Structures are given as structure tokens and as C-alpha cells.
Amino acid sequence: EIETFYKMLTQRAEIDRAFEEAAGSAETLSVERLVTFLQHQQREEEAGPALALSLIERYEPSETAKAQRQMTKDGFLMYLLSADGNAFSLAHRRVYQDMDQPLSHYLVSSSHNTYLLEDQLTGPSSTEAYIRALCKGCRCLELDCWDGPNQEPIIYHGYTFTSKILFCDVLRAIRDYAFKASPYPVILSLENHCSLEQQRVMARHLRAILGPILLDQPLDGVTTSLPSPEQLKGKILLKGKKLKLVPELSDMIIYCKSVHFGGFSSPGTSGQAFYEMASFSESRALRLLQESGNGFVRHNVSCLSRIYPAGWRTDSSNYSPVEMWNGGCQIVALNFQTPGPEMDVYLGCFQDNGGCGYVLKPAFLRDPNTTFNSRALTQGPWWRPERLRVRIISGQQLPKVNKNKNSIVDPKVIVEIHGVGRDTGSRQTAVITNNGFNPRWDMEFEFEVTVPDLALVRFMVEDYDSSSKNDFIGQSTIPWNSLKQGYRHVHLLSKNGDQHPSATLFVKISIQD
Ligand SMILES: [La+3]
Ligand SMILES: [La+3]
Ligand SMILES: [La+3]
Ligand SMILES: [La+3]
Numbered sequence: 001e002i003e004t005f006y007k008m009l010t011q012r013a014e015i016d017r018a019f020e021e022a023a024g025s026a027e028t029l030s031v032e033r034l035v036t037f038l039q040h041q042q043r044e045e046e047a048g049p050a051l052a053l054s055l056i057e058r059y060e061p062s063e064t065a066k067a068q069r070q071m072t073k074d075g076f077l078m079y080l081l082s083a084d085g086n087a088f089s090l091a092h093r094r095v096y097q098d099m100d101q102p103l104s105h106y107l108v109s110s111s112h113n114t115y116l117l118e119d120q121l122t123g124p125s126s127t128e129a130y131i132r133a134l135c136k137g138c139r140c141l142e143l144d145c146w147d148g149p150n151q152e153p154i155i156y157h158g159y160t161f162t163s164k165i166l167f168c169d170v171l172r173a174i175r176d177y178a179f180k181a182s183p184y185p186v187i188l189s190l191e192n193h194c195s196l197e198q199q200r201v202m203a204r205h206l207r208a209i210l211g212p213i214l215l216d217q218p219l220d221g222v223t224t225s226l227p228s229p230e231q232l233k234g235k236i237l238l239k240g241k242k243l244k245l246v247p248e249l250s251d252m253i254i255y256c257k258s259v260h261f262g263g264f265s266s267p268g269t270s271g272q273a274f275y276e277m278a279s280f281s282e283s284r285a286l287r288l289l290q291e292s293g294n295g296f297v298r299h300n301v302s303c304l305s306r307i308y309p310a311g312w313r314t315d316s317s318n319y320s321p322v323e324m325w326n327g328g329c330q331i332v333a334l335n336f337q338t339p340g341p342e343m344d345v346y347l348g349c350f351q352d353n354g355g356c357g358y359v360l361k362p363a364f365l366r367d368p369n370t371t372f373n374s375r376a377l378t379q380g381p382w383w384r385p386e387r388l389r390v391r392i393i394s395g396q397q398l399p400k401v402n403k404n405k406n407s408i409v410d411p412k413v414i415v416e417i418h419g420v421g422r423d424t425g426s427r428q429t430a431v432i433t434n435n436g437f438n439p440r441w442d443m444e445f446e447f448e449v450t451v452p453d454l455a456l457v458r459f460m461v462e463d464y465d466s467s468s469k470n471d472f473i474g475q476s477t478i479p480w481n482s483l484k485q486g487y488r489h490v491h492l493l494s495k496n497g498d499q500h501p502s503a504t505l506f507v508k509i510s511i512q513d
Helices: 002-010 013-023 031-040 049-059 063-067 073-081 127-135 167-177 196-213 282-291 294-302 341-349
Strands: 106-108 140-146 186-192 236-240 256-259 276-281 305-308 331-334 358-360 386-396 411-418 425-428 440-449 456-463 471-479 486-493 499-512
Touching: 013 031, 013 073, 031 049, 049 063, 049 073, 073 486, 127 140, 127 167, 140 167, 140 331, 167 196, 186 196, 196 236, 276 282, 282 294, 282 305, 294 305, 331 341, 341 456, 341 471, 386 411, 386 456, 411 440, 425 440, 456 486, 456 499, 471 499
Parallel strands: 140 186, 186 236, 236 256, 256 276, 276 305, 305 331
Antiparallel strands: 106 358, 386 440, 386 499, 411 425, 411 456, 456 471, 471 486, 486 499
16 A cells, blocks of 8 residues: 555656557667657657667666666656756757847847836835846846935936935946856946936946946947847946936947937938837837838847836736737846746746847848738748647646645646737646646647747646636746657746746647648
């Protein structure tokens, strides 16, 4: 009974089944059989003895089997629960993209009113807020500078009751964390409401504190286009108004001069210079995407655009970034302090490319002559329909969330597709009652995705409640091109983006054209 219980609790038929198929009669997976699995099931492109062997050396617990080059059911499971078995491509969890194109070519991880920890009206501000964002890979930060006592500028939310902090204090924190998560450039958006004098103080602090990290001169030969993340590695650059404004500050604005949206027209006139950056509220952005779409896109190829949350979002709620990315908008600022599907999707996007904060835009969005408009889909390279089938098999050790000890989760799983409007979809599994340890769904969904290069697949697990709103249990959002095939485990994250060490979903993914 003990082994029974101990082992039965521990038992996963789906795994058993999976191994069996792979291994057939044998109680072991030979290299060849493993290689076959890797290819047929896991659809690995580098599938071959070499991979198989590394998987064995890496994950096989049995010394006999390891040495003898074979994989036991145990090693199978371990591989499946490891970074290699993760539905989120391990290969993409390291900088692997081309980091040599103009900044305008990458989506950049950006935060809105970074200094804030809660609401926009009366919640607190803190350097901690900048540290958190930076530690989550945020590249573009916001500083709302106002005159403070003792000729020391402060940062807070202009015209509200949000607590205040010191501009200098903010700079040190940025200085200390700017590159903890990535080596690529950090952009500081200065919304300067300070007096001339205090503006000078700002400049002094900038130079004194940031020192050599601060970019205060154009790079050599950085003429027709924006420098690349590579060219700006290890640097912090300022975005703000460039000559009310003291020269000390205005002179530090090199590649990001705040500008009012003129309109889009590129033959050298109208559509701003590569070193000019416009901002658009969520509303105006949608409208321009509604009406212009392709203009914006084309605009965004050589130009950085910044989008920020609608003013009514005083609760610091966030909008969907995806809609902005579909127009090539790169600096899509969100309230990083706020848990929700939006940051889930955001951080899922940026978990790609090594989490360095710059993710290369799809080629059609880097083509100045594109006729793409996610909203009016016509044929073109972006059109490449795929058939995704996702099987939600079972869940393991779902984080018991709210109640301290009184009930068991009644989990269900929602799988959503995020991307161009026609691709967006959502489906959900049934609810398993009182089981978070090993709920088993064995449900399969199928989606047709026409513009995968802009899609993300999200897995959300909820605790069903008949009486109330279902509690969020965990989630995971995987960019389409990082979605691995075959049997994989989805590693669930908390509301706050934290890793749940033992919480997973076991799935089987398949993508066919
Ligand atoms: La602001
Ligand atoms: La229950
Ligand atoms: La419940
Ligand atoms: La509940």
C-alpha cells in the first residue's frame, strides 16, 4: 500500500503512455528510439544522436542506462519537465536575434509612469518601482520631473496625490540596475516640469550619476538611421524635448527628441526624422490604426513610436499591447506594477530573445514598402496559415492559492490565441473538481492562425467558483515562434510573473501548415 500510495500519488499514466509509445515493448529508450521520438513527436529540427545523447547525459538518472546510452521512464519524465521539455523554447531564452538593426526595428520593453507602485491618483511612488521594472527586463522607463524642496527635483505624478521621490535617488537605482537583466540600451523618458534652475540640477545629476553610461553624443557614423541595440549596448539614452528648456538637458537628447505627432509621409518630409519620437495615447493609437494602419506601420519602420495608457486608467489597469505591436509600435508602455493578462502577454513577448528587452520585429514590419495592415489582411508574406492543435492533458501541483487550508482547487484551463484580430480566439476545458495535484483533462483544441508571426499562445489556469469570480491559479504566454512541439510541460507563473517551481501543465502541441 505504501509503495502503492507513495508511487500512485506519484503516478502519471499520460507519461506512462507517452513512454510506452516511444519505447514500445522495451523498458528503455535506446538512442535510436529517442531520436525517433525527438523527430516524430517533439519535432526537433536538430534531432539526431547528438541531441539524444545530450538529453540522456543531462537527464537520465540511471547510471546503467546513462552509461549504456539509454533513457528510462524516469529520465523521460525529467527531460519532459526540464528546460528542454519546456513548451517555451529553451533556444529562445538566450539572445539569438539580430541585434544590429535600428532601434525602430525591435519591440522594446517599456513601462509607464515607472515610478508608481499602485494607482495614478494617490498611491505611492518609489525607486523600488524602477528596480522591479528593470529586473523584469524593462528597457524604457518614465520619469516625471517636478521642482522639489532644496533645489532637488522630485518625481511624482503631476497634479495628483501620488507620493514623491527624488530624481537623484531614482538615477542611482537606475544606474545600479539598468543592466542586471540585459546589456542592451535603457531609454529614460523625461517629462520635464522643472524650473530652469532645477533642470540644471537634473543635468548635473544625470552626468554625475550616470557618468559614462549616459549617451551624450551621437555615435560615429550614426547618421541616417537610429543606432542598433548593439551599437548602444551598455548605454542609457534620454528621450525628451529638445531646443523653457536649458541647454544642459536639451543637449543630452540625442536620438529621441519628443515630438508631436505630425502625420505619416516619408519622402524626406512630414513623417518625423529617425531621431524624432512621437507618443500616442491608447485611444489615438487605436484610431490611427483604425484609419491609417499601413501608414503607421510604414511609419514605425524607421521611427520609434510610444503608446501609453488612456487617462481614464487611473487604476493603473493596462491595455492590450498586441494591438499596438500589430502596427509595429515599439515603445508600448504599460503599467508594470499591474498584474493581468496584459502584463502576462507583455512579459511573455519579452521572455523571447533572451529577455534582453529588444525583440526583432517580423520582416514585413521592417519593410518600408509594406502593404501590411493587420486590420485589412491581404496576401503577403505575413499570410501563412497554420493549424495549431493543443491537447491539455493534465496538470501537476497547481498552486493552491487563496484559502489557507479549507478547500481544494477546482481547476479548468483556458487557451487563448493573441495576435491579429482574425486570429484571436479562446477555448476552455471542463472543470475538474477538487484536484490541483494532478487534474487530468485530456482535452484538445484547434486553432487556425493566419499571421503566426504576430501571435502568442496563452495558457491560463483558473479555480472555478460557482458563487464567485474564478480565482487565477497560474498562467504562461508563449510567442508563436517559441512554442515547442510534442509533449511538453507548461511552467505556470503567478499573477506577479513569478515562477511556480512545481506547477505545470502537461500538453501536446502540434503545428501543421
Ligand atoms: La508621465
Ligand atoms: La473545491
Ligand atoms: La473552487
Ligand atoms: La476559490
